[PDB]
Amino acid sequence: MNITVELTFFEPYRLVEWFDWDARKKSHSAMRGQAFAQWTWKGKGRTAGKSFITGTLVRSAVIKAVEELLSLNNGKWEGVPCCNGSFQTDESKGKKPSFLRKRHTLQWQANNKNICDKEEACPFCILLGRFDNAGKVHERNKDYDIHFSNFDLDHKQEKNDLRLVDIASGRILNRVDFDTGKAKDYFRTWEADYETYGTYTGRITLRNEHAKKLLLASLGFVDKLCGALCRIEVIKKEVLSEDHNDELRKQAEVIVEAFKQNDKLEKIRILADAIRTLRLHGEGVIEKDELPDGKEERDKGHHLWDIKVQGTALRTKLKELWQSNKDIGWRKFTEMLGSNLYLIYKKETGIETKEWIIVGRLKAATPFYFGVQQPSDSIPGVINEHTSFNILLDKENRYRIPRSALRGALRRDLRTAFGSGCNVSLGGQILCNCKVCIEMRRITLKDSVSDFSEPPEIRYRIAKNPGTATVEDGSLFDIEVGPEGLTFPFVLRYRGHKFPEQLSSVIRYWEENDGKNGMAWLGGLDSTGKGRFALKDIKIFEWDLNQKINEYIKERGMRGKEKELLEMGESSLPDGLIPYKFFEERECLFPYKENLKPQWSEVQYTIEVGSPLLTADTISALTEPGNRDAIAYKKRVYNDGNNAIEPEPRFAVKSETHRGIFRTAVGRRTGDLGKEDHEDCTCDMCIIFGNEHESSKIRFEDLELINGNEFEKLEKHIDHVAIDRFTGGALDKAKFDTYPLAGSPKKPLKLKGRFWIKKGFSGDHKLLITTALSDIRDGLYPLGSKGGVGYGWVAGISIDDNVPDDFKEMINKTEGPINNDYVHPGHQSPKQDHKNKNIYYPHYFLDSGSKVYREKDIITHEEFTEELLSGKINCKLETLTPLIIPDTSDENGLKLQGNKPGHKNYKFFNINGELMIPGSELRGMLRTHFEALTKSCFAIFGEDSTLSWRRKCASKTLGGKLDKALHPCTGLSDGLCPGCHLFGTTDYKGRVKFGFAKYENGPEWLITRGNNPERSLTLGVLESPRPAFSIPDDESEIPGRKFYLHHNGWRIIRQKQLEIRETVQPERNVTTEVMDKGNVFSFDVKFENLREWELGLLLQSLDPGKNIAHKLGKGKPYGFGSVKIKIDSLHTFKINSNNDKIKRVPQSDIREYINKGYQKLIEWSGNNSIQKGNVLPQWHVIPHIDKLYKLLWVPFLNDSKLEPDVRYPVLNEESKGYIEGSDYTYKKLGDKDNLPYKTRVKGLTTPWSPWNPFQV
RNA sequence: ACUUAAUGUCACGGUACCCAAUUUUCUGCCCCGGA
RNA sequence: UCCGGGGCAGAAAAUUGGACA
Ligand SMILES: [Zn+2]
Ligand SMILES: [Zn+2]
Ligand SMILES: [Zn+2]
Ligand SMILES: [Zn+2]
């Protein structure tokens, strides 16, 4: 009469600490522990315990089982009506039974008059224990009628004691409102394992065989026990790893202090994130050394992977360490190294019923994420690792979907389906029987684990202070995300009288068909489009409970093989299971057509990009063979076809950027983004996008790229470099590069994207969104980074038709002048040349006073202030002399290295074979001119450089001789110089944004006969500038800015090709294509939020007037690169809540702008003695502008036959190209005698000074 | 035993959720001396 | 006293703050 009962699980269950009820009544946090298994300590300490299950719980479950089984057959066994029950009374005759218990107990109506009485006891009460020697709370004997010994754990390696951290893990659970999204509270819980500790053993004894068939059959029926499924079955009869966690600590220290020796402490954090990101690639990168080896020799290497530690290269120490500890595995290796480095850096800084089954597959049509607390939550009682959040993970690194979240989301959607929502109550004494609760307590779910087991992906998110459009400090964090395209199994049970049509509603709503994308919104962070799911291969089954109960038991409820059902053939089904017809499909279901479907409405559209596009992701760049600095973002996706990551990634733009763009747009428009009372900001932005109080009402997604294959080379190298405003050469450590996507004005990129709206918007709210969309289509907000220099502009929008008609209407309804200035610089009358001979100097210097005007106040970017203007300008760029702009991406474009090794060749800057000028160069040119005009601060100047006259060393560096007032404008408090104020600086984004230049009208290539490519040139020799000759000795000072001259001295080289190629070594010449005269490029600037006279001065600077021109391009001092700019069209629009739209401006208004700007500079001069009156402006009254214009003055434009001779001096008189008898060389010009130093300085600071006879 | 009480366990009664543009600044440029 | 040669190849700041009594 002994029955050994074995228990089994199929899903991770829960555990809680043990207590006596005498003590348990106190610790309220143990109260929930009345249904979970028990875990007891042992050995007067921690970590050594035992696990069991209280027999009482098994008893209660068997009771509920017998109750249901009897309710089904209308209350009889084999036709024997039995007793209606006895419980719910137990009053005042003894102790109220421990575990006072309440729920809708049920009693069928019966006929018999015996209650399983003493002499004749129907099996039910014998099973209860009513007629025995039982005793309420006394257990003196093992004298019971039917006994339940408690169930304890089964373990094969029990020779050692179970450790708590081995079979337990902490987790947090919470609860959210029906509306407002937010959470209200949270409790803690312990989850077990179900793979290795899932068997539980017990023991049961009986006394009277008479009641067996009831119990032995009612056993298999029960399903839940301790919070999961089960199958009760009657049974017939490596410590170094830990040391590793410490030992690697040691090694970490060595790496740190060495970096401290070279004054490189901040790069530690970069190294940490990079070595973490190394997690995806695999071991190969170390064992074959695919690390981004440095540039060409440089006698150095990568600025990171080649630092020296203890006299060794880092990229070798890494291989050594991996060889040391290779038992752990690549994954934990990298993770531990990252954590250790993070911590060290942080320390250093400081009426019948039936059962319906649903099987099927879940798919995730977007990147998903479920969040958990943090690492370092050991099970018993500011260590924040370098991952501010984490995805959940299983034991073997697999993605899980815990039944908690599935249950919750199912409830929320069902609650919408009905229409009435009971906000859940805690610990009540009655049951809120609104229908939603009635359904919600009849369903059962199951967890889910995928097959993919690779590490996740990382993303970053920053904030942006709308004050100055800058990275808002103290806000930079990163989240983890799972791959898109994974698939889980999904199981949903139901038991009752009639399949509620609203359950069918929600299932259909989660379904996906040919033209219907599902919208199941599992998981958190559903605000920015993470978590959307869909269903596939739904196959609903149903039982017949009323007359096939033995067929249900014999298959143990078909629990534990829920995978077989999805794929088996209809014929091999187990007897008693039948496919479900009458599945109403999306048509008759009234709630779905009525309450669900209009929940979310989608908008879908494609942006069209017409320029290079770049979303900087600097971290990935450090682990790629490109040796670059910035790369386009990359997403990776699963593919259900091949069960592996797709071999080729996909470029995109992250959703959060989408969201930020719309947010800033609407905010800046309504003028609500600047107020600080935003926790309760009652303006419309807080209603739409949602502050912390309520949820949000817009959901974005990722911008994907589809027009990708048509391009043959997606990513095009580009280089950029600063220039010392004092010597027109490259500053030190200031030559970098980017590698963005290719985007042309003719073959534009194509990006597709979507975003959802929750039903309930009220009229004008739609108007705001539509306005912002039209505003993007106008082209004010650039996608990506580096806006001001052209990257990432937009050029149109094509709203797809399958949208709300309201949007189509609201969006579609909303969509010869400027001659030259004629300044007549008056610097004329033959330049005193007399046509005979005057060898001038290639470049000259310019002095610009000392005082600088500054403004403490700053104009913000909060909103389009009404008193200021904003618009765009179009322009055409016309060339005057052969031009050159090399393309540094290629080094053998002209195939010339096949004969003369080491000889560089280039070809003109081009994109998909469409000539084009990079804009940043135009930005630099305009900026130099504007600064020099307005007497700004030196933007980019190398202070740390010492010279030695010839040994006279420099007592102080260059920055010492230069006045302090002219040093770079550094801090926001001190104020900003007018130059830096307009174009911006490190902490204030500029307000003027240029753009690339397009190509136009004809004759193009200066054709030469002798040269092999017939259109290329071989430039002369070029050497570095020498600030020494400009500063003769110690007492000298920085003269000023540098400028190059205009002359037709290039054609000389156009006839010495054959000779130049002879004498000069091919290691120092460069050959490239050239563009001739007579070409015009398209060009345009866009400005927003300017003051009044600033725009006037900018316009004056774009075109100084007739007879004047800028300089640009490689090879300035020889004469290549004279350029003249005109204006064609101006647009200004004072955008605001008013209906004022884009309007033109006629001529004679720009006159007012320029005139007012002129007076502002008049005032800044402070010497009011200058003429004051009303007349067409005359620029050549203020001293320094006079010189500035005297410098850049095309002589040969007006008088077509007045050209001077400009050239550098030969070296030493018997130098190579020494003009005989000229006496135009050093050692007769640089000697202190025959030329006092002050006279040299004076000759360098008076433009257009005769130099061969050396007058003035 | 450590480890339960017996004519009365809705904890499958509770989603770790809300909110936050990887961005701001920078012309692919160029002459006189070294032991 | 004799006779010629390339350099720069990334620099600075931000690495988490609030919430749910
Ligand atoms: Zn009875
Ligand atoms: Zn309710
Ligand atoms: Zn608000
Ligand atoms: Zn400044």
Side-chain angles (χ1 to χ4, degrees), chain A residues 1-817 825-826 830 835-1256:
Chain A
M1 65 280 286
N2 281 19
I3 292 307
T4 71
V5 158
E6 190 178 314
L7 197 150
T8 315
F9 279 168
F10 285 136
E11 190 289 314
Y13 63 91
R14 303 180 194 247
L15 284 197
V16 73
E17 194 169 20
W18 166 242
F19 272 134
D20 284 330
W21 73 103
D22 297 342
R24 179 166 61 186
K25 262 89 171 174
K26 272 79 171 174
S27 177
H28 208 275
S29 159
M31 280 292 106
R32 305 210 71 256
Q34 294 194 210
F36 312 147
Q38 299 325 107
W39 160 261
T40 174
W41 297 114
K42 185 206 52 53
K44 274 315 293 204
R46 300 292 205 178
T47 74
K50 212 58 173 173
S51 173
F52 55 64
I53 283 182
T54 59
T56 286
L57 201 67
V58 176
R59 192 211 182 208
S60 189
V62 171
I63 291 301
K64 212 196 68 185
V66 170
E67 176 167 280
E68 285 285 337
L69 200 152
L70 279 184
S71 192
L72 282 197
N73 286 319
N74 201 30
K76 52 175 73 171
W77 257 107
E78 300 98 0
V80 184
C82 180
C83 321
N84 57 349
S86 299
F87 31 88
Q88 214 191 356
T89 72
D90 305 345
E91 90 296 354
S92 161
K93 304 315 291 169
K95 317 180 58 60
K96 299 192 75 62
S98 42
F99 299 159
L100 186 70
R101 343 220 301 247
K102 83 193 92 63
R103 68 179 160 87
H104 285 290
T105 179
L106 62 94
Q107 294 199 60
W108 73 104
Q109 173 47 49
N111 55 66
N112 185 35
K113 322 314 305 181
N114 297 314
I115 194 57
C116 320
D117 193 34
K118 163 84 58 156
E119 289 47 47
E120 174 70 27
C122 298
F124 190 30
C125 294
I126 283 188
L127 185 138
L128 270 170
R130 186 173 174 189
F131 294 164
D132 44 5
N133 276 307
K136 198 57 66 190
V137 196
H138 295 48
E139 60 278 24
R140 199 276 312 156
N141 195 5
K142 289 327 168 68
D143 171 31
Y144 293 128
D145 197 349
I146 173 165
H147 178 42
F148 280 161
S149 63
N150 51 1
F151 286 176
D152 53 357
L153 193 147
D154 173 34
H155 195 80
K156 280 65 57 188
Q157 278 51 56
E158 56 83 23
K159 322 324 168 194
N160 312 56
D161 53 355
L162 279 299
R163 300 220 303 127
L164 193 50
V165 195
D166 271 348
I167 76 162
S169 311
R171 206 153 73 82
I172 310 193
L173 263 49
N174 63 348
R175 177 197 65 166
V176 294
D177 290 330
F178 189 21
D179 50 345
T180 70
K182 197 200 306 289
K184 272 174 74 181
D185 53 318
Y186 66 107
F187 52 99
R188 205 165 317 266
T189 299
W190 298 13
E191 273 165 347
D193 161 24
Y194 86 96
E195 315 183 42
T196 44
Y197 317 95
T199 292
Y200 278 155
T201 296
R203 151 81 51 73
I204 293 171
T205 186
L206 280 192
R207 309 299 300 221
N208 42 4
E209 175 68 17
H210 200 192
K212 202 154 169 186
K213 282 171 306 192
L214 172 68
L215 174 138
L216 199 144
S218 165
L219 260 179
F221 192 108
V222 61
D223 76 339
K224 295 183 305 194
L225 187 58
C226 273
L229 281 83
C230 71
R231 282 190 80 258
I232 313 188
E233 322 185 9
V234 57
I235 290 294
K236 194 219 58 178
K237 191 52 68 160
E238 293 87 298
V239 75
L240 283 75
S241 52
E242 200 285 309
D243 189 0
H244 291 166
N245 189 325
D246 190 339
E247 191 268 342
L248 282 176
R249 163 82 45 84
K250 300 295 199 306
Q251 289 287 352
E253 282 297 328
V254 190
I255 311 195
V256 178
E257 62 90 21
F259 269 29
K260 296 204 51 187
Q261 305 289 160
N262 305 343
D263 193 352
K264 295 186 170 183
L265 190 44
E266 204 51 24
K267 278 202 187 302
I268 296 294
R269 185 66 204 280
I270 303 303
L271 182 54
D273 285 331
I275 191 52
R276 184 175 86 245
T277 305
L278 210 52
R279 171 175 28 174
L280 301 101
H281 290 185
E283 75 168 1
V285 176
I286 284 300
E287 270 300 357
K288 315 173 176 308
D289 314 287
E290 289 49 48
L291 278 168
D293 50 345
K295 207 156 206 195
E296 296 313 317
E297 298 82 3
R298 181 173 152 81
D299 189 27
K300 282 288 289 301
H302 201 323
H303 84 91
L304 174 82
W305 294 120
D306 289 332
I307 319 289
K308 295 175 185 295
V309 288
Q310 300 310 124
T312 309
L314 186 43
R315 94 177 50 187
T316 58
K317 174 172 284 294
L318 283 185
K319 183 170 74 174
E320 179 40 37
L321 262 190
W322 166 261
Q323 200 71 358
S324 88
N325 312 327
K326 77 189 317 298
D327 50 67
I328 297 301
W330 184 260
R331 182 155 169 152
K332 288 188 52 54
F333 179 99
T334 65
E335 303 208 359
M336 280 282 99
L337 203 63
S339 183
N340 265 11
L341 289 201
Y342 182 42
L343 270 300
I344 293 310
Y345 168 40
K346 273 302 182 171
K347 177 200 286 315
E348 268 301 320
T349 296
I351 173 65
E352 81 287 6
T353 41
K354 296 196 254 190
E355 202 159 288
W356 279 294
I357 289 176
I358 286 185
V359 310
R361 173 164 301 126
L362 276 166
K363 185 178 181 179
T366 186
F368 63 98
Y369 156 59
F370 310 89
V372 310
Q373 178 44 44
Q374 277 180 357
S376 78
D377 262 325
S378 310
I379 288 88
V382 284
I383 198 150
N384 42 5
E385 307 285 325
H386 52 109
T387 53
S388 274
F389 304 126
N390 292 145
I391 198 175
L392 174 57
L393 259 186
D394 199 334
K395 173 62 80 71
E396 270 69 25
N397 299 323
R398 307 199 281 199
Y399 301 83
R400 280 184 68 248
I401 294 174
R403 65 175 266 270
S404 161
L406 207 52
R407 171 67 155 268
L410 181 57
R411 178 188 290 247
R412 175 213 66 221
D413 280 3
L414 200 54
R415 187 181 320 180
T416 291
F418 279 162
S420 68
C422 59
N423 184 9
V424 65
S425 62
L426 288 166
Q429 215 156 338
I430 54 176
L431 317 177
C432 177
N433 278 337
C434 44
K435 306 191 60 51
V436 69
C437 291
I438 296 181
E439 284 309 315
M440 192 41 66
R441 77 179 63 183
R442 275 176 182 157
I443 52 185
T444 304
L445 293 85
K446 179 183 173 172
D447 273 17
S448 43
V449 284
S450 65
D451 283 329
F452 201 54
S453 51
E454 286 329 284
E457 184 144 30
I458 307 301
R459 291 187 179 200
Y460 297 73
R461 285 185 68 195
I462 80 165
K464 276 200 69 54
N465 163 25
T468 66
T470 309
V471 179
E472 187 31 81
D473 68 345
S475 42
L476 171 132
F477 51 85
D478 48 337
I479 84 182
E480 298 199 35
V481 172
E484 181 277 329
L486 218 45
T487 62
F488 316 97
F490 161 67
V491 159
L492 180 141
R493 297 198 198 270
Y494 190 97
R495 155 175 314 186
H497 306 229
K498 179 59 49 178
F499 211 82
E501 66 205 340
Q502 302 81 334
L503 186 76
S504 197
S505 190
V506 151
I507 291 301
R508 195 68 69 196
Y509 180 40
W510 281 0
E511 197 188 50
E512 191 149 272
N513 279 325
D514 47 358
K516 207 266 176 174
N517 44 4
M519 303 195 228
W521 281 87
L522 308 176
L525 261 187
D526 71 83
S527 173
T528 80
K530 292 185 189 39
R532 188 167 84 205
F533 276 61
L535 297 173
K536 298 225 299 298
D537 290 333
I538 279 175
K539 293 210 298 181
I540 296 183
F541 289 19
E542 84 179 8
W543 294 85
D544 186 306
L545 267 177
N546 188 25
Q547 37 187 339
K548 298 287 187 179
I549 211 68
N550 294 288
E551 293 76 349
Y552 187 118
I553 280 173
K554 190 42 63 199
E555 296 300 329
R556 212 62 69 166
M558 189 56 117
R559 302 151 297 167
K561 303 150 193 169
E562 302 76 342
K563 173 175 65 177
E564 269 76 359
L565 288 172
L566 194 141
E567 57 84 23
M568 43 169 94
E570 182 277 348
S571 67
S572 60
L573 293 173
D575 44 353
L577 196 47
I578 280 185
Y580 178 62
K581 299 307 207 321
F582 317 137
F583 191 19
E584 329 290 334
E585 61 287 8
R586 199 198 259 119
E587 49 93 22
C588 277
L589 291 88
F590 178 67
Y592 156 80
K593 189 171 309 171
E594 185 50 278
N595 272 92
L596 284 195
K597 160 174 274 190
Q599 184 77 346
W600 300 98
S601 65
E602 73 181 9
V603 181
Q604 160 164 349
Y605 66 107
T606 82
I607 307 169
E608 200 147 324
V609 171
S611 279
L613 161 69
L614 166 63
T615 313
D617 176 81
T618 181
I619 305 313
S620 198
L622 299 196
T623 81
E624 211 64 22
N627 185 203
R628 328 178 175 284
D629 292 18
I631 312 177
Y633 180 95
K634 302 187 303 184
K635 271 171 44 178
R636 47 204 298 273
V637 295
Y638 202 85
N639 173 9
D640 211 345
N642 302 320
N643 314 60
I645 290 307
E646 201 153 298
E648 201 280 298
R650 285 230 287 280
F651 309 80
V653 159
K654 304 171 294 182
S655 77
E656 303 87 300
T657 294
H658 213 88
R659 177 183 194 110
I661 289 172
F662 275 172
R663 189 206 217 280
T664 303
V666 164
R668 180 177 289 174
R669 165 160 327 289
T670 66
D672 313 333
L673 187 45
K675 65 176 70 176
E676 81 297 331
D677 183 25
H678 37 259
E679 59 87 20
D680 207 3
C681 175
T682 60
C683 316
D684 298 331
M685 158 172 45
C686 289
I687 283 189
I688 299 280
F689 288 60
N691 52 15
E692 71 276 64
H693 289 345
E694 316 173 42
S695 157
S696 203
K697 288 166 166 46
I698 288 181
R699 285 179 194 170
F700 304 87
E701 259 164 30
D702 279 336
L703 287 174
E704 196 155 40
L705 182 140
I706 62 171
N707 179 85
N709 61 346
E710 297 184 352
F711 287 149
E712 56 84 20
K713 186 160 194 54
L714 267 179
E715 39 198 358
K716 181 165 185 64
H717 207 147
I718 289 184
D719 285 17
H720 292 130
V721 56
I723 290 91
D724 169 70
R725 303 287 191 261
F726 165 59
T727 77
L731 193 45
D732 303 358
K733 306 151 90 52
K735 188 265 181 179
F736 52 97
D737 44 352
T738 78
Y739 194 62
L741 303 164
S744 82
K746 287 312 192 58
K747 311 189 56 176
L749 277 182
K750 296 205 158 184
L751 304 183
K752 196 159 209 165
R754 294 174 295 182
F755 76 102
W756 308 88
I757 291 185
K758 157 182 255 187
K759 185 187 76 64
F761 274 180
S762 45
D764 58 345
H765 277 325
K766 295 178 183 177
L767 195 79
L768 285 181
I769 296 299
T770 299
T771 297
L773 187 62
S774 195
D775 211 314
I776 282 182
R777 196 205 41 236
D778 214 318
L780 277 75
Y781 293 131
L783 285 83
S785 70
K786 272 197 179 69
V789 283
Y791 291 130
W793 271 359
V794 288
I797 288 183
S798 315
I799 292 193
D800 180 282
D801 57 355
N802 281 82
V803 310
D805 193 341
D806 300 331
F807 284 78
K808 280 205 291 185
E809 298 319 322
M810 297 168 188
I811 187 52
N812 301 156
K813 60 161 206 303
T814 318
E815 313 284 313
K835 315 313 171 280
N836 50 281
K837 47 175 201 59
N838 276 131
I839 293 89
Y840 305 118
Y841 214 81
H843 71 73
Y844 268 91
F845 271 69
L846 165 63
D847 189 356
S848 88
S850 158
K851 77 170 66 61
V852 193
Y853 170 75
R854 269 182 169 99
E855 278 156 7
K856 299 295 182 188
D857 185 286
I858 307 160
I859 281 157
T860 182
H861 298 198
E862 178 49 33
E863 54 85 23
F864 303 86
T865 319
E866 194 50 285
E867 300 74 2
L868 316 178
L869 52 90
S870 315
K872 94 196 284 188
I873 310 176
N874 301 342
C875 291
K876 300 158 65 78
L877 173 141
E878 207 279 337
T879 179
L880 267 192
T881 312
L883 192 50
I884 283 185
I885 296 104
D887 163 35
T888 318
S889 45
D890 188 299
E891 192 62 27
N892 193 20
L894 290 185
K895 295 291 168 57
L896 296 194
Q897 273 217 332
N899 297 160
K900 289 187 293 299
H903 200 184
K904 315 174 171 303
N905 54 359
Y906 292 137
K907 53 168 64 180
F908 202 47
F909 194 91
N910 74 319
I911 295 178
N912 317 117
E914 319 197 353
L915 318 184
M916 173 176 313
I917 290 175
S920 72
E921 214 182 327
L922 318 178
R923 177 190 201 93
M925 209 289 309
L926 270 296
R927 171 161 187 182
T928 284
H929 195 139
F930 177 43
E931 291 152 325
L933 180 48
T934 178
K935 209 160 306 180
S936 76
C937 76
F938 282 70
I940 306 311
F941 159 66
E943 65 294 340
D944 183 317
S945 280
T946 293
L947 76 162
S948 275
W949 311 271
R950 271 288 92 201
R951 203 160 305 98
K952 296 75 175 159
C953 73
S955 77
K956 316 175 219 174
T957 182
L958 266 39
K961 297 294 178 56
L962 175 50
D963 185 302
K964 194 53 209 195
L966 259 179
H967 265 171
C969 293
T970 178
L972 274 301
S973 44
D974 185 286
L976 290 194
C977 70
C980 287
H981 186 193
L982 179 58
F983 288 72
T985 178
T986 317
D987 320 326
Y988 175 41
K989 161 173 187 170
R991 309 201 302 266
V992 179
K993 311 186 257 188
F994 293 100
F996 280 172
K998 215 166 57 175
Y999 174 70
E1000 282 194 4
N1001 297 319
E1004 325 165 341
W1005 311 85
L1006 162 63
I1007 305 180
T1008 294
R1009 314 303 309 119
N1011 169 241
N1012 186 3
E1014 303 318 325
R1015 69 187 188 280
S1016 44
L1017 267 73
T1018 48
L1019 272 299
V1021 56
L1022 298 171
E1023 212 162 277
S1024 174
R1026 190 76 50 82
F1029 179 64
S1030 42
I1031 308 169
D1033 44 45
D1034 61 69
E1035 50 80 20
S1036 317
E1037 303 80 358
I1038 316 300
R1041 310 171 185 271
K1042 185 196 291 179
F1043 272 115
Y1044 287 105
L1045 216 52
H1046 281 292
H1047 61 246
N1048 194 21
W1050 55 280
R1051 66 173 72 259
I1052 282 303
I1053 309 197
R1054 212 195 84 166
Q1055 297 162 2
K1056 316 310 150 189
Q1057 295 286 290
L1058 57 88
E1059 192 271 351
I1060 287 301
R1061 274 188 314 282
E1062 286 310 280
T1063 173
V1064 177
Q1065 208 180 352
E1067 290 296 18
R1068 277 175 292 283
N1069 272 340
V1070 284
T1071 73
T1072 186
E1073 316 191 89
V1074 180
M1075 297 271 306
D1076 192 350
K1077 301 175 61 59
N1079 315 132
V1080 303
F1081 291 129
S1082 157
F1083 161 82
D1084 46 352
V1085 314
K1086 204 185 294 284
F1087 65 100
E1088 57 161 0
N1089 209 341
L1090 272 61
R1091 215 182 295 99
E1092 185 57 31
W1093 50 261
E1094 273 185 36
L1095 176 88
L1097 281 191
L1098 173 66
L1099 280 176
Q1100 164 59 220
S1101 172
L1102 251 189
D1103 166 34
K1106 191 150 59 71
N1107 202 12
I1108 312 288
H1110 293 103
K1111 275 280 278 291
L1112 183 140
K1114 171 181 279 192
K1116 290 176 286 299
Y1118 286 151
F1120 295 119
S1122 57
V1123 177
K1124 174 183 184 65
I1125 294 302
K1126 311 160 190 169
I1127 304 94
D1128 264 13
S1129 89
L1130 201 165
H1131 300 346
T1132 181
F1133 65 100
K1134 290 209 305 306
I1135 181 171
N1136 207 353
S1137 315
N1138 38 65
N1139 194 11
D1140 316 335
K1141 298 324 185 202
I1142 179 54
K1143 93 188 54 176
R1144 203 191 180 107
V1145 57
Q1147 202 270 330
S1148 88
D1149 308 328
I1150 45 182
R1151 293 297 194 271
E1152 170 270 2
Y1153 289 124
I1154 292 173
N1155 171 30
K1156 202 175 310 308
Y1158 168 39
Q1159 296 177 357
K1160 172 58 66 175
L1161 199 39
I1162 284 174
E1163 198 268 1
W1164 273 350
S1165 87
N1167 53 5
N1168 318 106
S1169 82
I1170 57 173
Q1171 190 271 337
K1172 294 172 71 175
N1174 293 37
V1175 59
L1176 189 67
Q1178 42 187 355
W1179 298 114
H1180 51 72
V1181 51
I1182 310 173
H1184 70 266
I1185 302 92
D1186 177 26
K1187 303 186 180 188
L1188 166 67
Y1189 280 158
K1190 275 177 62 175
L1191 268 301
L1192 42 90
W1193 171 68
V1194 50
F1196 67 95
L1197 170 64
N1198 309 356
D1199 181 281
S1200 306
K1201 65 181 293 296
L1202 194 140
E1203 66 292 345
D1205 165 31
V1206 195
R1207 79 173 77 255
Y1208 273 98
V1210 287
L1211 196 143
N1212 62 354
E1213 206 281 313
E1214 75 92 24
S1215 285
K1216 272 299 316 193
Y1218 161 65
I1219 307 155
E1220 186 66 23
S1222 84
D1223 202 326
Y1224 173 46
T1225 179
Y1226 307 86
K1227 188 178 179 181
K1228 269 175 296 300
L1229 197 46
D1231 48 327
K1232 185 197 67 51
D1233 315 329
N1234 177 31
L1235 199 147
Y1237 294 163
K1238 293 181 179 60
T1239 71
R1240 204 156 72 178
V1241 194
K1242 295 299 314 312
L1244 279 184
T1245 175
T1246 316
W1248 287 101
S1249 41
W1251 202 273
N1252 178 18
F1254 201 81
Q1255 302 328 314
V1256 194

